[PDB]
Amino acid sequence: SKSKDR
Amino acid sequence: HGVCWIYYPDGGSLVGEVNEDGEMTGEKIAYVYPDERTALYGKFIDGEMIEGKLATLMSTEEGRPHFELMPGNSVYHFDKSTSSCISTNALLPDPYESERVYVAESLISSAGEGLFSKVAVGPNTVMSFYNGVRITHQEVDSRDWALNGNTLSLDEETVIDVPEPYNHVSKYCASLGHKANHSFTPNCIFDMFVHPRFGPIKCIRTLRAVEADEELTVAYGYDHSPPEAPEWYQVELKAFQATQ
Numbered sequence: 001s002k003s004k005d006r
Numbered sequence: 007h008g009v010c011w012i013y014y015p016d017g018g019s020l021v022g023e024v025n026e027d028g029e030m031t032g033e034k035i036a037y038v039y040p041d042e043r044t045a046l047y048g049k050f051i052d053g054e055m056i057e058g059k060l061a062t063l064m065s066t067e068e069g070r071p072h073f074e075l076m077p078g079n080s081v082y083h084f085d086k087s088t089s090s091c092i093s094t095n096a097l098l099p100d101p102y103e104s105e106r107v108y109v110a111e112s113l114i115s116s117a118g119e120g121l122f123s124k125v126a127v128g129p130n131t132v133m134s135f136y137n138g139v140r141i142t143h144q145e146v147d148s149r150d151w152a153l154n155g156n157t158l159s160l161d162e163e164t165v166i167d168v169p170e171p172y173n174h175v176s177k178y179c180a181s182l183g184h185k186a187n188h189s190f191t192p193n194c195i196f197d198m199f200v201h202p203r204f205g206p207i208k209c210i211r212t213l214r215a216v217e218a219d220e221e222l223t224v225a226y227g228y229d230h231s232p233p234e235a236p237e238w239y240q241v242e243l244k245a246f247q248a249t250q
């Protein structure tokens with residue numbers, strides 16, 4: 001996923 | 007005749023006399039931040055902030071909080087973001103965050119701006135809030151990294167983003183958590199937070215004590231074995247691995 005903290 | 011306090015796991019709370027049904031409904035209800043001092047006091051309906059005026063919790067007597075209202079007419083409202091609207095008041099700062107952090111040039115090379123501690127604090131201290139628009143994982147993962155500098159996963163259904171031009175503090179400063187730079191050796195972590203203006207979001211919380219003017223960093227936590235990550239991070243990742 002292209003987001004922080006998944 | 008008594009007062010109830012209802013704490014969130016993050017340490018914030020709602021406090022006041024509950025109505026006949028045990029709901030936080032009335033004109034003298036407060037949300038109290040995790041410092042147990044900064045408060046938003048006034049009209050709530052079933053725990054939702056309708057009009058909270060900035061206040062300081064001065065003492066408690068028999069469990070009942072006694073507040074002093076701040077001057078300035080700073081009032082706040084429950085104002086959860088949507089997919090297209092980050093805030094009804096993008097330039098109205100969070101009053102707890104404003105005492106704790108500021109934005110300046112990062113001490114990290116080529117890393118732009120960073121987030122810094124205004125005063126010395128202990129471990130486990132909530133420092134900053136990561137509010138933003140609420141979009142899907144599908145939208146985020148199917149677009150290029152250049153659009154995903156500020157995305158933060160909230161849960162399995164929602165990603166929080168601060169899209170341009172709201173990444174500039176002149177356009178948005180209601181929250182500042184999207185200003186924390188990455189470190190593989192961080193002093194802070196992301197944690198869940200239930201905010202009376204922003205709703206369910208994430209916050210930045212210290213891992214350990216931090217000094218005044220120390221830069222706050224968090225591990226961005228990109229998947230290293232899907233690295234599904236921007237280039238500056240992939241570079242950094244190797245450097246880190248070697249120093250281990």
Ligand SMILES: Nc1ncnc2c1ncn2[C@@H]1O[C@H](CSCC[C@H](N)C(=O)O)[C@@H](O)[C@H]1O
Pocket residue numbers: 112114115116117118119120155156173184185186187188189236238242
């Ligand atoms: N450890 C690091 N090294 C280099 N650049 C970093 C970094 N951590 C964060 N960044 C930069 O910060 C962006 C994420 S947003 C963090 C705040 C940003 N520096 C700003 O000025 O608004 C990244 O896309 C990257 O440009």
